[PDB]
Design a protein around this nucleic acid. Sequence first.
RNA 1: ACACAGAGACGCCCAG
RNA 2: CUGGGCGGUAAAUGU
RNA 3: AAA
Length: 1991
Amino acid sequence: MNLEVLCGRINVENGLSLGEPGLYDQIYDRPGLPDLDVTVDATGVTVDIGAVPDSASQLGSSINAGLITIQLSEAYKINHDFTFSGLSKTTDRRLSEVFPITHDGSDGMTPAVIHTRLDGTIVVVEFSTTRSHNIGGLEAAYRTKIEKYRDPISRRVDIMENPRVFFGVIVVSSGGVLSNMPLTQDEAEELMYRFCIANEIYTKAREEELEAISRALSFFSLFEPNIERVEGTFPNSEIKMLEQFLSTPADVDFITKTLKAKEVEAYADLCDSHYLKPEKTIQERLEINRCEAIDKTQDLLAGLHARSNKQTSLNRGTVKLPPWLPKPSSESIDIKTDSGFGSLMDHGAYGELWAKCLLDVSLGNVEGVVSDPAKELDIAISITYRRFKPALSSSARQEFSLQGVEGKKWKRMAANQKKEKESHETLSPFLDVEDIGDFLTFNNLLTDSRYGDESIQRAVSILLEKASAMQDTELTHALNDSFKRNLSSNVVQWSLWVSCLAQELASALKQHCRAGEFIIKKLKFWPIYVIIKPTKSSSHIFYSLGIRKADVTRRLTGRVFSDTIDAGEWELTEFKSLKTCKLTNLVNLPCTMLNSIAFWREKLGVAPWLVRKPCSELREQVGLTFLISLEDKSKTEEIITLTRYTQMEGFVSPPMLPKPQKMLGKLDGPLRTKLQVYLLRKHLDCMVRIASQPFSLIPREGRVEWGGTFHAISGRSTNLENMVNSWYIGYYKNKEESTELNALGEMYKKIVEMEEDKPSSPEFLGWGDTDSPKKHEFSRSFLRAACSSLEREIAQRHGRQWKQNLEERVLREIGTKNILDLASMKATSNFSKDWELYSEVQTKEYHRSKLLEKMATLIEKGVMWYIDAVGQAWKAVLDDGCMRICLFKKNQHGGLREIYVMDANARLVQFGVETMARCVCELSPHETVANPRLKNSIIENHGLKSARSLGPGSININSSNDAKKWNQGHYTTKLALVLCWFMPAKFHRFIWAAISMFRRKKMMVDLRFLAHLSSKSESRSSDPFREAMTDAFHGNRDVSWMDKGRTYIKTETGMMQGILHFTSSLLHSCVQSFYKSYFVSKLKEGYMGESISGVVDVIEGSDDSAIMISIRPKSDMDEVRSRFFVANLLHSVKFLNPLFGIYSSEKSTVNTVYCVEYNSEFHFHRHLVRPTLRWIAASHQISETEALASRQEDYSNLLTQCLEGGASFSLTYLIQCAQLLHHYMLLGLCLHPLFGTFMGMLISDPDPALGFFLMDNPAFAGGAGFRFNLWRACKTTDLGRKYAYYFNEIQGKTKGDEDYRALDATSGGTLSHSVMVYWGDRKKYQALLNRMGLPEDWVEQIDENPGVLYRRAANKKELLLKLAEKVHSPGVTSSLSKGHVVPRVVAAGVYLLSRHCFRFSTQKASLIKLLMMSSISAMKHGGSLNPNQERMLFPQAQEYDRVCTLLEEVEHLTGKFVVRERNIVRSRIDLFQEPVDLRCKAEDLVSEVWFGLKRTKLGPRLLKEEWDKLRASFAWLSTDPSETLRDGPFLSHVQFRNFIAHVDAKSRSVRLLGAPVTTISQVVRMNFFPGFSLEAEKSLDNQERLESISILKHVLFMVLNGPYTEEYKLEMIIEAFSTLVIPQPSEVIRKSRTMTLCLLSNYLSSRGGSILDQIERAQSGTLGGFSKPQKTFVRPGGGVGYKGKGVWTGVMEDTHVQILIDGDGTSNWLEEIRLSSDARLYDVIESIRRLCDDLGINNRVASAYRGHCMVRLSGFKIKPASRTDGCPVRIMNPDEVKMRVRGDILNLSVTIQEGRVMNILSYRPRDTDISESAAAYLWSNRDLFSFGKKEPSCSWICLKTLDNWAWSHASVLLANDRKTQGIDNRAMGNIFRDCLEGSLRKQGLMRSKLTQELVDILEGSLDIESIFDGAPILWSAEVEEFGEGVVAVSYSSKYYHLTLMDQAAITMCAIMGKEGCRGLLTEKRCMAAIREQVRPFLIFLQIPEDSISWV
RNA sequence: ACACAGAGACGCCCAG
RNA sequence: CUGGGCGGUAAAUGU
RNA sequence: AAA
Ligand SMILES: [Mg+2]
């Protein structure tokens, strides 16, 4: 029907109305039904509509014969949208548009139809249907639909002017129609007919949260893929296997037999492999092992030498660059031919070429060789190369073509063929690697060059001193001098000119040249000339070097450098080649060398400010780093990398021997470089040395240390940290390198090798159990047992209802997904049927498209929910029959990895399974890849459990594991069985089909690879894979994985890398749970039927795993038997691992005592080591961005990540200096002639996002972010004037200057003005935009409806707009193109200074022009920032000021060297936290004001107040969104939203590692340099005026927690508050102790008057507390949880509220709300939500009260009173207050009535708020307060130690009870004893005070004593536990920071004896002559003298 | 020179 | 043998 | 007293 006539026949009067319900009934007779054929599939449901039966009543004319399609998701609401088909205009609007904003929370609610009438009236009609036959049901539905809408519509119309609205509702059932809408009878009859058809079709076919749940549930209920088609298509995809796996139980007898067999096999391997039997001495055993290792190394060397040329002596250079080190000079080109050019030609073809090259340059035309500054200066304020063609004689061309400059044309002749045949040769191990050996130990790299006076050093020093102007202390000068000394060196200058050469080559990389011509160019500073012959930009580029040979002042020593040809006066070099990938390391060379020098000098103990000769060890590390960076080969990295695995075996304890000869499987391979031969020889020597003897464990007092550590490459013995960091030297290589076509055959070899052996019989692939499986089989019963064990664990931890919660979570996570979430920049494959066959796509080019294009078509098709697009993708995959995969290579710091790109439909299908697997993995207590908090929890908390259960002196045993081929080896049926086991039986079909689609993998190959492959039919070659591939492609031989003439490789086994990550993690978790259950079951038993006591902890990731087991022995013999038993248990795992599909790798290290590694984190007892070299190396991998500020912020992020790995602040400062040098070099330092003018002009105006580089304070360098440095710069230098002018123009006070104003604010609090234009990907990005076809006027459409940038959005055009603004994002879309960032940045930096390439935020101007415009600019504004502007711009400026004022306490380099702290743990230092007074968020405030949706929890009155404050800040703001755009200085709402969202405070948390732990002062004193203390010098006058409240908190803590009576405490509090001055309170909504202190001071001073008004104003109208408190529940080590039934009573916005709460165990919940007066309720709701989330209680728990009330409240959302859940909302003097002090609690208690206590404020001092600076401030004012009179005060009130006579007087006070004013007895003694005990434990002596069996789920031949002889005994060592759980317990004492008894213990230890004290605390023994002196300390210990027994 | 237990690049398209 | 015109790829799953 |  129509709506126009229906709305026209409605008369609307002024106001609101509801009409009267008109009950309608059927009148005309009804025909039966048209034909309604309905079928269901994955696409949808098809509704075939037949012909309506004919009748005279014209019923059925609305329908039309045909077919109707409905998607599966919305099949639940079929009656509603088919009975009411039509009659709706769609484009559903909300109440926010036509009605104004009321801020009631009901704005998000929208009706079905909303009609703006032709005369302006508003009519809203609501539809409702029901399958009932009673009139009462229709009346109930009508009343419900009336009442759920009447109240909010009334509230909306009782405010808007001239309201004329009408509300209607239509209820249609199968028995009648009830509606207030006047309708004709025929309309009712046709609606009845449509309802009958709708419910017939439904019977035949059968809040946003609830809608998503219903949609997902309906989809999974109606989804039915044909199982038979899957079984006919995919192998081993029968549901019978799944049903059998879920049906039959396990066979326990088979499990027992298999366990016994594998146990005896493991025992046999352990006994025979490690030479256990017969009896032998340990020395004999290690000698036999060493002989075996020597034999294996020798036969490997012989086998490697067999397939090689002999070639004992060979001439080659590992470094291609010459060792020249010339002095820098000016940029003046000088030929200066003195001996004549004639002496050059008669020295070879190189001499002829160089003579002919220099002769042309001698004949004028010097332009092009050196840039002209004049031309650049006149062009900028308003790339020419010197090409030449020499003679090129034929012999010269031949000799040059030998090097490969023109190798294609000169390929035929015999010399080039000989060279090509010789190139394919592998060098021999016996090559006499001699020069490399003595180059490392003896080199002159670290000798000072005495060059620190030239122009480059002058420029960098000028820039450094300009950057360090803000911080002008002595420390900065010392660190700058150290950096300059590092800069002045031979290696650094060599790297500088090498990097200049590399930048020049990268600039000249893309310059096409004709045949026979070259380019000559001179470097800017050094007198070095290069001749460049460039080929294609992707291909090689050639160069030769020439020097005067009279200007080479210095030269590096060593023979590793390549030979240089001498030609008379000039020295020349041959033609070498590089690519784009190899230029990365050459550019970043000087920064790399500076970082390495600083890092190793700091690590070797040399202080930065000292000057010493270099050590022998230092030169080895720096030379090795230099050689590795220069050679840049992939094979060289592996040898150094495997040193970690071959060296980790030295920690293995008895009875296992260290066997590093397992690593020979990867050391084999070709050796094409001399350096690789040297590294292999040193690796074998280290292997032999490791196999000879293990590492020595020395159990000293308490601590555990390892001895005999040494460096792998050079046999020098070092510390442990040096070895761990030397394990990672191989990371000094370019991670990304290009792949050539003769390569890439290794990938296909890795793919096909596993697939060759697949068991043909499928009986052991899930069908049945078997022992001793093959390379792919597994046992079903073991999987059943593991799944049952993990299910038992989950049911134990997460209760018995975990399955239903998991189902609801899965449905919620899958129901809310849109297509726009899936769209991203990730690539996808276009491989299809037409690409399969060759010889038809040979003359075509294959390309990969982004997922954005594939999702844009789906979005514009008309689907938005992800749950709608799964069916089409699944059907398309099933029809195609195979998953289609593309391949490429990802190069990493390790072995090569194959990466699988995936099709779009396959990705869409895989997303849901990945989501389900993640949801299942979120519950496991062992898995860590989805629970990142667990990896730092399981390892650290093992010590606590070991100490708590077993007791003190436990012995730990650990094992670290890995997997050979995790991606391969896994048959997908196992994963499917596990997932279906862990699911509630409704997802089973979908998971089974989505897994079964995997086993038809078809992987493409490169088309050029096949194009070169098809030409050749004979393979030759020495490897079988090439012959097999050639014969299979040509069809000569037949293989299963590839057929004739196809472009795809077909496999059947394995899962790809990462595609099924979470499912593999779940399987690994099941296996580890089974292992733990088996281990504890066997640990219950013991040797000879004993009972070994211990604890087993297990942790795992994707493939990595770790087992930690600790036991406690009582004697020696049982200790040795227990350790042998544990060795057996840890050795059986590698034989239990063939069961399932694990196949544990060779890199696993087993049976180590006090060490365990997991995810590259090494725990060595209480010393935690993290390799920081891997982060220091990666400190220059910046990303391409639109602005320079983003480059600086990326530098800051990399520096922070480097600091978090663990490094001193001096090292961080030096790394920041290196980053500054790198940035300034990237900004055209050595590529543009006008950089000197640029810096000389820039030093006047330092400006971030303009060219200047800000630098941090040396004391605190990495913790502070970029905003802190911006704030310091704005408050220190002239940047504040420009920022003030910019912000004033933003305010609108200063108008004009349309193009001068800055609007775009980059993330990080940096508003920007300009952006560079020239992007290489910009044309590609434009093409990408063209091929998707977005609307052009997206900004015009987004300004019309701005409410889509703040909501989820539902309209299709809304989604198109959101996608359009997603593509046009400034950062992500333009930056994720990626590539080799550094070479392209270098190439663009040759013209960035002087060329029009910057765009305003349309004239394009140079950087110098931008500097001139900024000169005629805000520099003339001359105004500073006011506190309002600073508070708006920096929302955390107070924390910045506090940190800065604390920071300047350290300004001088004075300190003492101390012993290094040997207890390293992690920490979480919180700083720069979110402000408490801000009370709101800008974006949330704007969203709530403009669109009325609940973002912030602020009431409408507070919203009005904050809006008035913001309007005071910004004048052009207004409630109407459209008014703000034109009035304000903004172009579009996108820019406004970006500007608003960018400037908002974010909390900054650092995670330092070091000694356990103001705290900033402690971490800046300890971590400045290891073994050194910074020793800050404080100023007295600062802390009293900066934070006087901290002194008050200190005094309050030391008074309340102290030995004082209550009256004395009251008087002390009164006088302390009277003496100090406290600022006035600030209004906050979050509870704070500072505000309570201010209120307490104002109350006791009585200055504010009515204290209740002040309290309610400070807490924003909130008053009250607990009338009946809640009884406490003792918590296991924490504050007592308040449980029971209680009441919260108070006032809130002039309303007498009363809240009833209840809780049980975990949290409290709302029970009942009683309120005095309704008035406005919404402010009450927001206030009570703030109270609830401040006190931690929840609203989700349902209430049992079913009685009558006014409204319901559930989940902090208002609900109609008809519904039954949620909390009911039923409506029901300053002289009385006083001071009351409880135990460590202050309260302003004021009882409401007699019989109960009513307190309204709280304050408990803690252990944090104690400062030594506050104690010193109290010491200066010792006579001011009353505490200076007696001895307990001035020592307990202040913080100081106790003197000898002082503690003697204290002891004689202790001996007698006496009576002293407010001093007390027996409690002062308690705190004294606690302080003395804590002081005792710090120095030593006194020790710090501190299951899923398998059954319910289901000898003595060795000498032992001899095989464990010669080993230390560990139970007699008394070694402590490790982990942060133990460490944090020892600091739990409240009086930890007390020095009141340290000197007492120092004096007592000497007089008593180190062993004597321990005997005293155990046996109570002492001798009399020292008893006379320890008797005062015996009364301090409160131990009687008659009890202690004398010796 | 680069890559590789010899699968490739060492310019490509034209026009005469 | 000359002469003219140039543009690529590179990017996978998760927190 | 605390999340
Ligand atoms: Mg592995």
